[PDB]
Amino acid sequence: DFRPVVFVHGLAGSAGQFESQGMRFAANGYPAEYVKTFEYDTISWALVVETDMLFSGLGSEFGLNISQIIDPETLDKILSKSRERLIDETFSRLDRVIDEALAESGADKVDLVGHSMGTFFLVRYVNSSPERAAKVAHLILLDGVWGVDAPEGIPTLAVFGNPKALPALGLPEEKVVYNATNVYFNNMTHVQLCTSPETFAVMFEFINGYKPATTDIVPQDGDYVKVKGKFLAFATNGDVSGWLSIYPIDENGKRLTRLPVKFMRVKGDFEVRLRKGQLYEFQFRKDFSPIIYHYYRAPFVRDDLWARFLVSKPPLDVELLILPERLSPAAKETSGLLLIRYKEMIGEYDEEIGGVDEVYVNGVNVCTERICPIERAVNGLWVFDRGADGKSDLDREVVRYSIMPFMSAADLVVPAEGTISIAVKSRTGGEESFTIPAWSADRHSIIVQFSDYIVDKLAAALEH
């Protein structure tokens, strides 16, 4: 019998970094409900908690950077929170999740997995009391804390990627969690490490004692899948209110039904039954905003209980960064996109990584060495007409994003006429392409989520 696994994301992260992994666990026999995700406000956590000296402030670095855009009065309110109180509140909520999971499954202990800042969070959590540590069969720490001992008596696995994808003004000649089994994937980058099928295999074997029969997201039988998802605020992860309209679409992004096949008021959570292998447009209207959001992604092939749709909201309203252009005349005639992949898009070649991604928008590669260098760990690439001047200047950095963790931007004019072609040729092999309507930036925002792994028949065969 499998025991539940509970995943704790990092700064500016969410359940999305464990979506693929949850589906791999289920493909290998785990009831899908046994894979839990614990979400929390990462801005308050990084600034209030991880700025202490337990780890000499290491767990807070990306939070310090991303916080630059917070309004002064709001920042002060955030920093005024009691640190001991935030900790006890958040940790008590994880106790509840773990206790409910043990009762639901009948298991005696759970496996806990943390990514990046989530590893700092979990080391504090298990060391906070013997009762908390007692409920953990295995602890997995992905590309986060290092130079510390594994919590006493808890079998710990630490998996590390290439440090070039993280801030390097520090000098770790090696990252090790003492007394843990340490595994290294030097050809992988920060978030990629969290979502990789190779990481999946190492984790499954560590906690189960045998290699999984497959690391593929195996499609399930039948024509329908259950999807449980949430619309939540980027980085702070609070539930977001709005209206969800789902439309099945063709290969060119045209809606196949006049009316949406699902229409609902949402407050964070939502659950829907959809057709397996079908392309959908998830249209979202958030309360109090005039923009209509159109979310695109590959079809679902099995139940997915961890889908996440990110929404820009205060205090960290990152979308405000593209407001000047959205308010310009060119917005009526040009589109604005956010391309997301939880596996760094890399345009700079490094022999250790071994290859570069190519990301084409209307036939132009925006994943260049200047826009997607390895050190920026690009998981979110904003594509819009910077300056609203009708000129593409890919060689000139879009400076406003330089300090934003995991994001970059490309100044490319995308005509809001007809459709937009978007394709990624993955550095690890395979390609995924989308053709969608060219919604104008004045009224619409377009979010395209690339899959974090592509299994290509020919490439797999060539390797075999």
Residue 411 marked ligand-binding: yes
Q: Among residues 77, 85, 254, 391, which is the contact residue for Mg ion, using CB under 5 A?
A: 391
CA–CA–CA angle 98, 101, 103 (5° rounding): 110
Contact flag: residue 332 with Mg ion (CB under 5 A):
no
Q: CA 7 to CA 13: how far, in whole Å?
A: 11
Contact 327, 246 (CB under 8 A): no
Task: By CB under 5 A, tell whether 341 contacts Mg ion.
Answer: no
Whole-angstrom Cα distance, residue 366 to residue 360?
Answer: 6
> Nearest distance from residue 383's CB to Mg ion, in Å?
11
Quote the CA–CA distance of 370 and 365 in Å, as a whole number: 12
326 binds Mg ion (CB under 5 A): no
Within 47-106, the residues that bind Mg ion by CB under 5 A are none
- Closer residue to Mg ion, CB minimum distance, 96 or 273: 273
Instruction: Kindly state whether residue 396 participates in binding Mg ion, applying the rule CB under 5 A.
Output: no
Do 86 and 48 touch, CB atoms closer than 8 A? yes
Nearest to 460 by CA among 216, 277, 190, 220: 216
Residue closer to Mg ion by CB (options 77, 391) is 391
Q: Count the residues of the shown chain that bind Mg ion, applying the rule CB under 5 A.
A: 6
Query: In the complex with Mg ion, which residue's Cβ is closer, 287 or 389?
Result: 389
| Contacts to Mg ion from residues 399-458, by CB under 5 A | 411
Least distance CB 155 / Mg ion (angstroms): 5
Name which of 219 and 355 has its Cβ closer to Mg ion.
219
> Residue 168 or 323: which CB sits closer to Mg ion?
323
- 437, 279 Cβ separation under 8 angstroms: no
Closest approach of Mg ion to the CB of residue 326, in Å: 13
Q: How many CA atoms lie within 13 A of 234 on its CB side?
A: 19
Binding mask 348-387 for Mg ion (x = CB under 5 A): -------------------------------------xxx
Is 391 within any annotated ligand binding site? Answer: yes
Binding site annotation covers 385? yes
Q: Which residues bind Mg ion (CB under 5 A)?
A: 385-387, 389, 391, 411
Can you say which residues are annotated as belonging to the binding site for Ca(2+)? 385-386, 389, 391, 411
Can you say which residues are annotated as belonging to the binding site for Mg(2+)? 138, 385-386, 389, 391, 411
